[PDB]
Design a binder for this molecule. Structure first.
Ligand SMILES: NC(=O)C1=CN([C@@H]2O[C@H](COP(=O)(O)OP(=O)(O)OC[C@H]3O[C@@H](n4cnc5c(N)ncnc54)[C@H](O)[C@@H]3O)[C@@H](O)[C@H]2O)C=CC1
Ligand SMILES: NC(=O)C1=CN([C@@H]2O[C@H](COP(=O)(O)OP(=O)(O)OC[C@H]3O[C@@H](n4cnc5c(N)ncnc54)[C@H](O)[C@@H]3O)[C@@H](O)[C@H]2O)C=CC1
Ligand SMILES: O=c1ccn([C@@H]2O[C@H](COP(=O)(O)OP(=O)(O)O[C@H]3OC[C@@H](O)[C@H](O)[C@H]3O)[C@@H](O)[C@H]2O)c(=O)[nH]1
Ligand SMILES: O=c1ccn([C@@H]2O[C@H](COP(=O)(O)OP(=O)(O)O[C@H]3OC[C@@H](O)[C@H](O)[C@H]3O)[C@@H](O)[C@H]2O)c(=O)[nH]1
Lengths: 459, 459, 129
């Protein structure tokens, strides 16, 4: 019966932007307009310097911008003439009220739903696409159900996004699965079927899963948690390794070869970050508490607690090696993004390690090859003026530093000329490898004269 | 240049038996003698009725018993003339003292190590092969180090077993990996190398991992924990599903298609059993406490707690549907083994569900197509005489039963003639599917007139 | 396991609150077969002090050498001067290996190398580990 010719996506961020760019590149006969309230963000999408760093994104966007892909601040007209409307906005964590610091704030999703009613007539498909959807489908539906025009027929779908930042293009093109939730009604099926059509342009039919909206959202919450759990589990083992002279990377390989366990996501680290994982577990915990499932609640909470412990442990290892005093000591922080190949800092372990060292009065010199320097400044908030310097390049940061702390797995960090760094560092020269990037360069670094300490090997 | 011609394995159980049988079948030029103190177990190994049920085991044993595979009670002479000695004995959980209910008792491992010293001269390789090795290598080594003859040279290796009961043959032949731990010394490497040689007869060289003994044992502890954790995680989700009208199997598929998560071991169930998992986690927890890592300890403990909760919940679901009273009510228990395709009941969720129902005064009629009936009796201990009947076949068990409770995923349970059962059950007729075996037969069973309740779903 | 010394200090027969009672009970909860020697504590007192579980695990030794015969470890709880004197080569020959001495009183200070030469694994309060 129905074919999607015009698509509108509200929210031009790390989800909405790339996911739409790819849709446009795969569906040249579809008009894709991505809208936002943030003007300078949209402007940047239209510039040759994109607002987010993501490998292969400049290439995908340029290939079809001004053709079938558009970025505009004109939300109203895009919703008005669109067949499908994506909601890909952020649901920040509530800072006050019940759920403070824990439950997600649906205020922006709601604002979108309202603004869609006000600007729509006829048939439209409204699809919620977030990285961690929390009761989102249901809250849109209740706004639509109450603000009913005649001849207005709005279908609500859930379509969670599985992309991982830094590899968004690769992931969007060859996704592991696509998950679409819709109502179990005649009208619901037709809307689901229509969205599959979009995806079927480049995704195999048996890689597309269709279900009801709630089962869809729950799947994503759980999926995210399982992922987060693996990192926390291996990090836990990393503490055990340091305590008993084993090596987590080795133990990891051995764990990983069980085809029932899989060998991905066992890379122990200073702790997981990003806007997905921590927020997702917290919401799952909160949900369980509200449903009167305290046993489940406290089970998943452990993922967060382990992660917190992982960070705090690594921090006090640095503070220890410096004889529990770092007042007016130059420390280099290499890497601020929550992972490699992005500029995103949301929830980066870097932020936390940094703050711990700041509470010790360390003079921090921070370098990251892609994170905007204003962003580093915002993230560490006064006390910032006295202690923080954003370095132009890594060598400035390490010049006269007592210690070098690696927090993000940027490939460029294996490359640095380490003899040069050692010459101009204060002795004893410490490298703290929170990412396991300097594995294999181990002897060399000791030969040069480094005292070299890494996560999950030899406390 | 060393070559292993004679092998002796102390312990002829679910580990030692099958793992040696397969060694003999793959290495026809090696003499493999499996010894035990239990006489009627050895006798049964030599009979046409083997002491343990395991698919394909009869075929493997018969093909090379008397030719190169021997089962004998004569421990002393087997040790005396062997090049390699396996220790594959049980380490039961301490019932008293520090570690009560938690830490493993190394008493039998020690008895073996002593008995080996007393019966050995020259060069021998001693290899510890257990399903969950706890400080086993180290304890053997301290006995050998102190009881030193001249010309006696005993090498200690760790070689954890990854097989899963019910698929031991398939697993032993195509293992995911083989893990060997030996000392990082000239003498150590030679012994490790010698053991690889045995395995290289049928296992690709790049599927064999070599390391130090401790790193090896820790790997197995961790690996086992990760496995157990998946089951508990999905089980936790199953409670969430039941509370919100989603379906865990569906959710599971969606989680499972993430190639980073893998799709194995997401089969929600009434709770994991067997002699590996619970015992492994407890020892890991205990080890962490002792190493002053409480944060890690309490992280892994959650796996056990969730599992306990999973069982308790399912139990009181049955008691609930029967209006909180089961005094003098006939309930059929289908399945008693901890999993399908074995006779083993060690830690079977069936034991626990059964006891919960016994404390309610239920008359239980238990059927399992492979569990010896004496074993069921031992496992439920007096109160047994008054309440328990071991049924000859499933239909006896369901005759006049208020409810049928499925605890083990035996394939034969989908086959049963369910109209027949429903005719002779008291109404309302309840089926409780703790294994998800009756998925797909859902309407049929409702048509027939069953009230059908299953894990991860709601009525 | 051999327990040498049961009196709460040397040169008395008094056991009231002796650390020996406590060490012994901890080792009993582990199911150790205890052979207890004290040159001045009435045998009956030892029996009262460890209270059934006593019958199965406790033996009051006539002299120290009986106690250490076939023992895995020797535990010294009371600073009786006579304990420095014992013929330790004799004890080690008839102990199960590895032979442990646990010096809870610091009486074997100075005899340290000798005991290691003989082949003991020797651990004491306040040293090493
Ligand atoms: N914002 C936060 O602090 C957090 C958000 N999350 C979640 O994780 C996922 C990440 O999504 P991103 O694309 O990375 O977020 P984002 O913040 O990078 O991009 C969202 C864009 O939506 C725009 N927007 C918000 N409300 C709007 C409205 N009412 N009308 C028009 N535009 C609007 C914002 O201005 C922003 O440019 C989200 O889908 C959300 O589920 C999780 C934790 C924290
Ligand atoms: N038995 C229990 O209750 C528990 C055992 N475990 C663990 O499960 C793992 C799997 O091993 P299985 O083959 O399933 O156990 P098993 O008990 O089925 O086989 C071990 C065999 O070793 C024999 N044996 C024991 N001590 C011996 C000795 N000192 N000398 C000679 N023979 C001796 C026993 O007679 C027994 O038949 C074990 O390696 C152990 O780590 C964990 C928790 C509980
Ligand atoms: O093995 C690992 C993997 C990841 N991490 C760290 O944990 C964080 C997780 O980042 P991811 O690589 O999972 O990617 P993202 O956080 O950008 O996206 C993640 O949530 C959004 C979902 O769409 C993706 O399915 C999920 O992977 C990063 O800091 C990463 O470096 C580890 O410390 N160890
Ligand atoms: O999805 C699952 C998988 C497994 N399980 C349960 O977990 C228990 C053990 O299952 P397994 O397949 O692991 O059988 P085992 O316990 O004998 O083997 C396990 O322990 C020993 C190790 O060598 C093996 O690698 C490990 O699989 C059973 O109760 C099984 O039903 C689930 O409940 N759900």
């Amino acid at each position: 019966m129905f074919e999607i010719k015009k698509i509108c996506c509200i929210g031009a961020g790390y989800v909405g932007g790339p996911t739409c760019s790819v849709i446009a590149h795969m569906c040249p006969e579809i008009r894709v307009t991505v809208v936002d309230v943030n003007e300078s963000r949209i402007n940047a999408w239209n510039s040759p310097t994109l607002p987010i760093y993501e490998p292969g994104l400049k290439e995908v966007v340029e290939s079809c911008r001004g053709k079938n892909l558009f970025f505009s601040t004109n939300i109203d007209d895009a919703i008005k003439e669109a067949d499908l409307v994506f909601i890909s906005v952020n649901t920040p964590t509530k800072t006050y009220g019940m759920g403070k610091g824990r439950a997600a704030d649906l205020k922006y999703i709601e604002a979108c739903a309202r603004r869609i009613v006000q600007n729509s007539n006829g048939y439209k498909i409204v699809t919620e696409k977030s990285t961690v959807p929390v009761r989102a489908a249901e809250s849109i539906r209740r706004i639509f159900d109450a603000n009913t025009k005649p001849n207005l027929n709005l279908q609500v779908l859930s379509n969670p996004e599985f992309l991982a930042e830094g590899t968004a293009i690769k992931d969007l093109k060859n996704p592991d699965r696509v998950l679409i939730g819709g109502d179990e009604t005649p009208e619901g099926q037709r809307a689901v079927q229509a969205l599959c059509a979009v995806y079927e342009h480049w995704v195999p039919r048996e890689k597309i899963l269709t279900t009801n909206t709630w089962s869809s959202e729950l799947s994503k919450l759980a999926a995210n948690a399982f992922l987060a759990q693996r990192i926390s589990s291996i990090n836990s083992i990393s503490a055990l390794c340091e305590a008993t002279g084993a090596d987590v990377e080795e133990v990891a390989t051995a764990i990983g070869m069980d085809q029932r366990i899989g060998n991905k996501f066992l890379k122990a680290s200073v702790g997981f970050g990003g806007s997905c994982f921590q927020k997702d577990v917290l919401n799952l915990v909160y949900l369980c508490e509200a449903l009167n499932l305290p046993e489940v609640a406290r089970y998943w909470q452990q993922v967060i607690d382990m992660n917190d412990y992982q960070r705090r442990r690594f921090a006090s290892r640095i503070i220890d090696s410096l004889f529990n005093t770092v007042t007016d000591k130059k420390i280099a922080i290499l890497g601020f993004a929550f992972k490699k190949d992005t500029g995103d800092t949301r929830e980066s372990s870097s932020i936390y390690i940094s703050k711990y060292l700041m509470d010790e009065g360390a003079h921090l010199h921070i370098y990251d090859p892609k994170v905007p320097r204003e962003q580093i400044v915002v993230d560490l908030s006064d006390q910032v003026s006295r202690l923080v310097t954003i370095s132009k390049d890594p060598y400035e940061a390490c010049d006269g530093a007592h210690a070098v702390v690696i927090c993000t797995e940027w490939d460029m960090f294996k490359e640095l000329d380490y003899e040069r760094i050692h010459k101009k560092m204060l002795k004893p020269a410490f490298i703290f490898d929170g990412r396991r990037v300097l594995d294999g360069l181990h002897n060399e670094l000791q030969t040069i004269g480094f005292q070299i300490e890494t996560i999950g090997k030899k406390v």
